[PDB]
């Protein structure tokens, strides 16, 4: 069973895509604060872009989920 | 005051709806190749051959199955081995 | 981009035709100025001048060798041919440098330009020198500044002044030499 | 027909019958009306646009021809003349053309800020007409000179 | 009372447009009322120019 | 005065007899007007695009079928099955 | 009943003010009206979960366990992980029962 | 500040661009703070300046 | 899984049959309903004060 | 509201804010100075705006403690 | 027939999800789904999306504008 | 003959006519030299008949996208974007329509070697715009479907309508992926719109024609 | 047995993915704090966002977890 | 059964380059929301901006796709 | 061993965190005394990352 | 084969060098984002700088893809 | 043959100091618009000294490139 070993040992190195993941939502939603904490008054558009930053961000996320469980089921 | 002139006018399609539905099944239908599970044989082989002889297992799965691969038919036996 | 060619040889030219001629025309805030801000020169090593302000005051116009501001990211020191800078000061000591001697200013707030030609030009409303302070208003102050807070945003904003002020006081007060 | 449904024509079918009836000459003065108060109020204002010179120089003949002075027509028909209406033509009938526009506006003493185009459609190009049509050009072009109250001016790209 | 008719016409067209329009106006009423002003339009539409 | 007669198919005042059809656009009666003024000279870029696309989607299904023909012809002339024997 | 009116008047019944956010008291412990509805939300899938799973329950998943077992089989084609033993454990056990 | 002061600095770029703006909001802000303390103290000097004369 | 399709060549034509269906009725059927509205209230909305003017100059009732 | 400097999001202008810092650090000078500086702390003056021409409503500061801390 | 086709549709998809070999998985995304469209219409605030894009339309984003009344009377 | 009597002010109506009027700001047109009046106005309109129609473009593409991208939401359905040949065709349709405006432009001819990169550069973005939209369209539903298949295990193994916390806090997780689900339903149908209009608005510039000829002061 | 050695391997490959999100944390919190001391009037806000960005962050961190309990148990 | 193992972990190995993706993606959307907090008055201009960056850092993801697709089904 | 490469980016985090303390701290030390409490947050908040990487440390070795 | 299953290791392990180039091009158009924050009035000369910086970096992007191709179809 | 396998395999992972070469040529990139977005006026000497910077740091995306081949055919 070298085959569905393998797919273990590549869908472990796959996954370590969504460190920079985690890092890029970190940086993003920490500028948030800042830029929240820089004028209140459009804090509530700042969310929104951070919403929009969190969706699009989130697509990097889950090519890299697709692309473990395309090696871990398919 | 125009508002019981539109209630008369009830629900109504799309004004180009049939053309879309025409189009996608003629896309559907008009393929040019067998119908994916299908093969096509020689008309002999298709009057020599019984129903169940001439259907597949993959294609009739089981509705609802409690085992996951239970299929309805079983298909031919006669199997080339 | 510069759609009004603007200054005071041009107000002194368009101006003879719209005026009676029997009116010399005004003088302006640059004829009373002698240092300028683009001009070459005027820093000579390690000195620079450092015109150091306050409506009621001039504290000092010489020439320094370091001037320790404090702006509002933090203590910065400005050196003879320093960048050009427009820097908002905190309530914080400017201390002029002029060898071993140090006299250290503490200003309630202002502005510091470092212009192109080195010239640093601070620019406060009151400075008070350290010795002249005494240590005994500045708590009852930081711990009644502390305490009255109102749903006015204007008195939010005065508070946070005389907090970050009378704070910044007993910084620059109980860390003394 | 015509003049009893002015309202439902459109300027590309009016263009059609006035250069059919600019050949057979056939007119009235409640047809020229009609035709003329369904080219400016009844269709719209940049259909003259979409027309072509060689047709709304036929429409200028057509109204000269009878003497027809329709200045809200006249200003509409201006319209439709421009460097791109008549870059669209050949030479022989961007000649024609322009020829024809010169004369039905200098007949009515109608000179529009878009006579310049057609002025300038034979000032950029003079080796296609005689001196006598260069002298019915620049005769136009003193006219419109002085009722646009400026001085022609030729210009080059840059 | 010479050019009356025209005046209220105007009036009365407007007034009724104005007090429907971008509630429950129909498209048909519009068209009716305002017969030439749908047929300059739909030469926008027709001739490419509906962002005029 | 003006009589009504100057008002005709110009002006109309909101109806009392009956509410009428809706006037149709000329590109909602015949296809032939729409496909030749603004489908054709319009978006015949796009049309275009889907063409190219047909095309080269064509070509790409071309190149599957050979692939499935190479290996099927090289199965077939070494004795082998194919395919995975179906599966049941 | 007309077949398009009356169901849809106790559809406007039901959805507008046959509320059940306090004709089943509710407010005493949840906090808001967004609070519930989100609750609302998971119940329905948890709901949801549970019925799909109830409705045919003697069954080999298709999805992957992770080496449980639902009741007392433990051994049985319920939890096998190859699927053509449990197939034919099925069809033993299926002429039994 | 913005209105007119920094539109009559700008020469092909600006005159005003050459300095490091150490403030902590934007330099429209810096500059319309700026503005005002110059009109204090213009006009400080303007009626002391007056008050001698 | 699902990844390839069976044919590429009619996934793609459902693709151009349905965006230019779509195309087609927005042009047709959506946008003469869209710019009739929405010209109606900008000519009256740009004209009004021009139409104005010159209804005031043509009427000879004050 | 307004997008700048917490002065300036309650409303503040920058000359009334440094003002206040100014006062506030002459309310806690050493009393041989803070007296002496109470001198340029004093606001006395009058104004009166003019809507027509010649008339107008009036008002009035004699502080002699400083710019007014709380709103205008 | 839009009934008729919807639920005819409906049924047909749901033969054929129950079918799948991912057949339990397919028919809780239903109800995955269904549960955010009766959390979509439960939450929406529907005045404010009518007058929200009523608002998208400078058509009836105000009123119009014409014929001020005093242009056109007869006296 | 007979079309459909239409409300004015209908939703529908205020919905597309705030799409088409923003996807129609995408590519302004371009403020001229000369002042816009009678002279100018065939150059207008001129101009206004050699720009591209990447508004409606935009939003048919817009339109037909989050349709499909919002069918994969209801229940009973998959995206129709979700296929690789539907979303991929899609871009590459969109890209050839770019690529077609801009070989019209010039003469229909194919235009060292930084270039040749430039080209590859400019001929993956026929992949990239298609396959944007699929791969986000098929991720979350493949860990849609990944995430319920471990969030039913649970209640399989253990009892239904007991120990339920362990199946609440991955009911929520669902919840929460089904709702990131249509964000990117709607965010991937502007993305690729917003990507239209610029790739086919790079080839939407024209020479303004312009007056010739004038008569000044 | 092979498969059960690699999932060992796979799993911790997998996990390697918090790296990132624990620095984006960091990254976040320290925002947090600098923008709390930038102004002081905002920080009971402030925390908020910290909060909705640590759980929109802390969804990788649980996808790379049911990535890791996927590897061990499919 | 090592060429259909070495692709596995071939692409568990290539698709790798989703970390940087979404690093770079987190902090060009942290820059949006810094860059709109500065002056919110061009906050159209400047989403425009991310959008077209957004489009081209993520062509990258979509080459790592492309290579992890042609390791796995080629 | 390869598991525990995680504790790389959380000991990053809490460096960049408690440094951006010290900067906030001398950008106004007056709320220094709320400032270490967002610190401690998100320290605690930062060891939730680090306690599941050692989660998974002794669940691939004693699990 | 050893030979063909290692190539695809190969350019697996090549084609991480796109996340340097993701990170790279994510931090270059958020400053351009940031620097078209502080004069929008320059700000086409700011994306054509941003787009000839793209373009002279992801020429890394497609270095490391063609020794991605290189490896595996040469 | 493990000498040919080994060779692609460490031509592999030989490219991945490109991705750094990629992050330096994005940093230095978005600091060329930040600089030029501070004044306008010097921006062409800037963009001199980012194609200095350029040239500069493609050494070391050459120097990779060099290894790579000569990994390969050396
Ligand atoms: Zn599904």
Redesign the interface.
Known sequence: SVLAASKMVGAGCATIALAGVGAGLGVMFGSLINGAARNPNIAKQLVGYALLGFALTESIALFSLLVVFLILFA | SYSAYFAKAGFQFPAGLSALVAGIVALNVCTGRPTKGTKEISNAEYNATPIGYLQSPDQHPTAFPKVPGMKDVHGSPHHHH | EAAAPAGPKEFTEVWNKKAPSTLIVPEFPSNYTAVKAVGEGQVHGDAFPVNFYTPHSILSQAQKDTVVLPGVDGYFGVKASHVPTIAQLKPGVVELHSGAESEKFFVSGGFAFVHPNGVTDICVLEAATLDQVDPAAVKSALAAASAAQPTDEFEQAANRAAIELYSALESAVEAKA | NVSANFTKFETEQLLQIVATFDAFNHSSVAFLDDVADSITYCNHYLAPVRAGADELATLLTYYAKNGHERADLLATVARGFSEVSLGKLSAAQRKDTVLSALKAFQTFGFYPESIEAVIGAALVSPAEYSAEELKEVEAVKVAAENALGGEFVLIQEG | ??????????????????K????????????????????????????????? | VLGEVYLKDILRTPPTGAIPANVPHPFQTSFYTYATKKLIPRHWYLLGGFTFTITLYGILDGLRDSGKKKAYDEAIHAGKTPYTAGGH | MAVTSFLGKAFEKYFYDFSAYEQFGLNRFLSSKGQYVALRHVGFVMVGVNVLLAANFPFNPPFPTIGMCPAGWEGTWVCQADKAKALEMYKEWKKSN | PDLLEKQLEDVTGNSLDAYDIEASHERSDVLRDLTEFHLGVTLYNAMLENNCS | MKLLPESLQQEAATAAVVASWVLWHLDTQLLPTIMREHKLHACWAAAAKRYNEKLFKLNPSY | APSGPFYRVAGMSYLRYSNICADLLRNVLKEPFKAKAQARQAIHFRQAPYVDGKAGASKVYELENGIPKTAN | IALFGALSWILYRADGQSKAHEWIVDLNLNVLQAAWLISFSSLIPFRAVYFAFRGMAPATASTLNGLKTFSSISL | SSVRDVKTGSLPTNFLTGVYRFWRSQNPAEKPHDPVNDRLLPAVVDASDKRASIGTWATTFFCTIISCNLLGLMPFNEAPTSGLGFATGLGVSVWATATILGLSKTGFKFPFIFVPLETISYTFRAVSLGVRLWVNMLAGHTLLHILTGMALALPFSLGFFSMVPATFGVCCLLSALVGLEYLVAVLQSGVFSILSTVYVGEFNHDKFIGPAAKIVK
């Open positions: 009372e010479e050019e009356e008719l025209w005046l209220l016409t105007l009036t009365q067209q407007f007034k009724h447009i104005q429907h329009f971008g509630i429950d106006l129909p498209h048909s009423v519009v068209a009716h009322m305002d017969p030439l002003l749908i047929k300059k339009i739909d030469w926008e539409t027709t001739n490419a120019l509906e962002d005029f």
